[PDB]
Amino acid sequence: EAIVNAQPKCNPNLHYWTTQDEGAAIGLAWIPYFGPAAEGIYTEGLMHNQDGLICGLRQLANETTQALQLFLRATTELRTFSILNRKAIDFLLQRWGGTCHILGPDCCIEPHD
Amino acid sequence: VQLQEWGLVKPSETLSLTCAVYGGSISGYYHWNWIRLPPGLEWIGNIDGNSASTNYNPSLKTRVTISKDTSKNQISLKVRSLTAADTAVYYCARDPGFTIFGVVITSWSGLDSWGQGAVVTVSSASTKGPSVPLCLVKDYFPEPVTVSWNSGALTSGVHTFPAVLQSSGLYSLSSVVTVPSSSLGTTYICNVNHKPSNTKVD
Amino acid sequence: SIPLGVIHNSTLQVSDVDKLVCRDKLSSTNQLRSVGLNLEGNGVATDVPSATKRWGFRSGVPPKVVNYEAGEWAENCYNLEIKKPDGSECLPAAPDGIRGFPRCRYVHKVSGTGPCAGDFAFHKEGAFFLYDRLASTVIYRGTTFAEGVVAFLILPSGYYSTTIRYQATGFGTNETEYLFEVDNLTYVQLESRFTPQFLLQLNETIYTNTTGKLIWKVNPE
Amino acid sequence: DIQMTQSPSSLSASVGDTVTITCRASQSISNNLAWYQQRPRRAPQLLIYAASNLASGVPSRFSGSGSGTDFTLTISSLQAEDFAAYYCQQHNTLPLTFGGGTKVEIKRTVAAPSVFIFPPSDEQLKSGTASVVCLLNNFYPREAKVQWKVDNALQSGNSQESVTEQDSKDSTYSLSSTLTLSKADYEKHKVYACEVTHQGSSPVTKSFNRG
Ligand SMILES: *[C@@H]1O[C@H](CO)[C@@H](O[C@@H]2O[C@H](CO)[C@@H](O[C@@H]3O[C@H](CO[C@H]4O[C@H](CO[C@H]5O[C@H](CO)[C@@H](O)[C@H](O)[C@@H]5O)[C@@H](O)[C@H](O[C@H]5O[C@H](CO)[C@@H](O)[C@H](O)[C@@H]5O)[C@@H]4O)[C@@H](O)[C@H](O[C@H]4O[C@H](CO)[C@@H](O)[C@H](O)[C@@H]4O[C@H]4O[C@H](CO)[C@@H](O)[C@H](O)[C@@H]4O)[C@@H]3O)[C@H](O)[C@H]2NC(C)=O)[C@H](O)[C@H]1NC(C)=O
Ligand SMILES: *[C@@H]1O[C@H](CO)[C@@H](O)[C@H](O)[C@H]1NC(C)=O
Ligand SMILES: *[C@@H]1O[C@H](CO)[C@@H](O)[C@H](O)[C@H]1NC(C)=O
């Protein structure tokens, strides 16, 4: 399925911020005492709207809000993190939930030999 | 966001030019390139903002050095090559590539923002002050010169001509603006700033 | 339930419980990323008078928080310090681990009083209040935040900002009187026809001595 | 290493025509290309990235398509402000290669050169080297013929000619022919004339006596 940017406006350039989980700087930089503060842990970045990606992205989040809001109302976790790991396991279960064979679309095996 | 540049250079000397990045942190997932255009464009080199991975052009193997600085948020370029053909205009610009939140699909996309501009003249000639009415600015070195009318308040109708190098080496241009004949005598003054010699003229 | 977006070579496509093919391959949990996008990219109104029209108090609803790994740079953020007219607070203190939004350009620090007919302040439209890599559904006292929404994706002499102080009267109600606190004794009125850069030009001339508190009003051209 | 050539070098078209610029490559390239515009006396700007997407702040008339070895840029309904040099750009390879910038020229109906003359200034004549200026403004095409008549004498070799680019708003040229000589050969003559021979009735001559 595709996404249509139904929002009134769309900023094609996405100036984003994220953390470098491997910003090692071998030596003494990863020590919390000698490491950065709570503000200098990020590394910025820019994403151009290549092939309508950024406008097609700002709509996915506006639409995910509904299903995500109901998921939060269900759980009692004051801070919910397992959402990422949830879909990680469901993907394996969808492909390896029961038996398998190279006979149909449920399982993914291609033994040409 | 936008970029500004800072920079005559004697032969066999290192042309020290800095590319200060304003309105944005320099340490990021972007790249930073150096571009020049000889009179009558050319890529110089690329430095990775993250991990400091400097990559240059084959024609500039042992003649270019690009360094970064996170404290002052600037990027310097030293040119020790006394090629004498590098007397051109230089530019610095970034290219964010296609970086999907750290995932780098390709680190070479269109260069979105460029620099203000920086002119360099690789020649052996002492920098001589300018000389400004009709206002004509002649007998100056080196180029370029910025002329503003009424402190920049007068832009329409003004048309400054290109600079022609005289036989004596000193450049010479002319700056004339068309104003209503009724306004002549009721004020006006040409404002000039020669940054190479640091000499204002009004 | 919750939809994910798998970027395929040019752009994104939605595929979830119903939609799955062998072409997609997820070899490591690093490909999964929860992205928090600000509402600025949608074209909503960003000034203080309109932003506060999207927030309201409500009791009997347990607040919930969700994590987002990466986010978008925000230009206008908000930091509320509202207290009831008797003197008591209105918003809860930010719990441990929750901090202000990392990247903001204009942090609108609102400092006023209101009725606060509710325990927590929620977003009327349903958007989340973005914090430091944490998206909550309420507003925490004295904590900078930015409106926005969250998605879930499957992938293959320095820079600083400036805060803006405000003085609200009747926050969270249909009748609210906002004031720009340029100085403790010189404040000007506000309206939806004021831009953040315009307020930056005010101090540029407001010059922030027995005149006392002075309420000002601008009529530009 | 990877070579790319942008053609044609020169190109002239009228306002409203559709321009087509090509940029061939020596080696194969994916759908990753860029086009740039550089107006006279201004830094370059990004026009297209990835060979298909428009940059931020670009009018929806710079159409670019193609893939592989041959790419193409198209400007629908060319405008006067589009007077600039357009270059090529490579991606997904090293070194980053450019192309020969195609210089764009605009076509306009013939215009009358507004001829002006400015005798030297009291400060310009005190040093000992006076200079006369003969200005031509708002004429098309750039083809002109400006000669100096200093008391019937055809001045030659001492004049410095300088033609500018086509104006971004007027789409026309402007010539500033300056005659520079020493004060010795200046005071020996009274009238300083400047005739102009342009395509658009008869040669116009502007003189100036001692005053
Ligand atoms: C995902 O994205 C979508 C798309 O943007 C979001 O949709 C939005 O959802 C909110 C949720 O509440 C809606 O709020 C209601 O908005 C209307 C106004 O809508 C008209 O104006 C819209 C904006 O135009 C102005 O504002 C913008 C930005 O500020 C400016 O740039 C403009 O210049 C204008 O100033 C406009 O977009 C609307 O478009 C119409 O047509 C398009 C198609 O062309 C449709 O898609 C739209 O849906 C719409 O039909 C429209 O022109 C307000 O008037 C509402 O106010 C009251 O009534 C609401 C509904 O009952 C209620 O919820 C409010 O609380 C409020 O209540 C008032 O009335 C009550 C009685 O009825 C009283 O009891 C109460 O006291 C009070 O007086 C309301 O604010 C948006 O309209 C909607 N927008 C669109 C485009 O769909 C969605 O929110 C996003 N999801 C998330 C999770 O964020
Ligand atoms: C993008 O997807 C198309 C789909 O056919 C494929 O042919 C192309 O090789 C892909 N691009 C890559 C893998 O860079
Ligand atoms: C506001 O302007 C005054 C000028 O009197 C200056 O001293 C002060 O630092 C400025 N403050 C801000 C936040 O701009």
Author numbering:
A (entry chain A): 502 to 614
B (entry chain H): 2 to 8, 11 to 35, 35a, 36 to 42, 45 to 52, 52a, 53 to 83, 83a, ...
C (entry chain B): 32 to 187, 211 to 262, 268 to 280
D (entry chain L): 1 to 200, 202 to 212
From the study:
In ebolaviruses, the fusion loop is encoded by N-terminal residues of the GP2 subunit and is composed of a hydrophobic internal fusion peptide flanked by an extended fusion loop stem, made up of GP2 strand β19–β20, and a disulfide-bonded base. In the prefusion state of GP, which is the target conformation of neutralizing and protective antibodies, the fusion loop is found wrapped around the outer equatorial surface of the glycoprotein, forming a close interface with the GP1 core. Engagement with the host-cell endosomal receptor Niemann-Pick C1-C (NPC1-C) and possible additional triggers are thought to lead to conformational rearrangement of the GP subunits, release of the fusion loop, insertion of the fusion peptide into the host-cell endosomal membrane, followed by formation of helical repeat hairpins that catalyze virus–host cell membrane fusion. Recently, a potent cross-protective antibody, CA45, was isolated from cynomolgus macaques immunized with trivalent cocktails of recombinant EBOV, SUDV, and Marburg virus (MARV) GPs.
To uncover the structural basis for the breadth of CA45-mediated ebolavirus neutralization, we determined the crystal structure of the fragment of antigen binding (Fab) of antibody CA45 bound to a mucin-domain deleted ectodomain of EBOV GP. The CA45 Fab-EBOV GPΔMuc complex was set up in a panel of sitting drop vapor diffusion crystallization screens, yielding crystals that in one condition diffracted X-rays to 3.72 Å. One CA45 Fab-GP protomer complex was present in each asymmetric unit, yielding three CA45 Fabs per GP trimer. The structure shows that CA45 targets the stem of the GP fusion loop and mediates extensive interactions with both its GP1 and GP2 subunits. The CA45 epitope on GP observed in the crystal structure was predominantly located in and around the fusion loop stem, made up of strand β19–β20 positioned along the equatorial GP1–GP2 interface of GP. In total, 34 residues on GP were present at the interface with CA45, 16 on GP1, and 18 on GP2, corresponding to 32% and 68% of the interface, respectively. The most extensive interactions between the antibody and GP were mediated by the 23 amino acid CA45 HCDR3 loop, which accounted for ~55% of the total contact interface with GP. Apical residues of the HCDR3 loop inserted into the previously defined “DFF” inhibitor-binding pocket, located beneath the β19–β20 fusion loop stem, displacing native GP1 residues D192, F193, and F194, which were disordered in the structure (c and below). D the mode of binding of CA45 HCDR3 apical residues I100 and F100a was highly similar to that of native DFF lid GP1 residues F193 and F194 within the cavity, especially when comparing placement of the aromatic side chains of F194 of GP1 and F100a of CA45. Modeling of the A101V escape mutation at this position predicts a clash would form with CA45 F100a, consistent with disruption of antibody binding and viral escape.
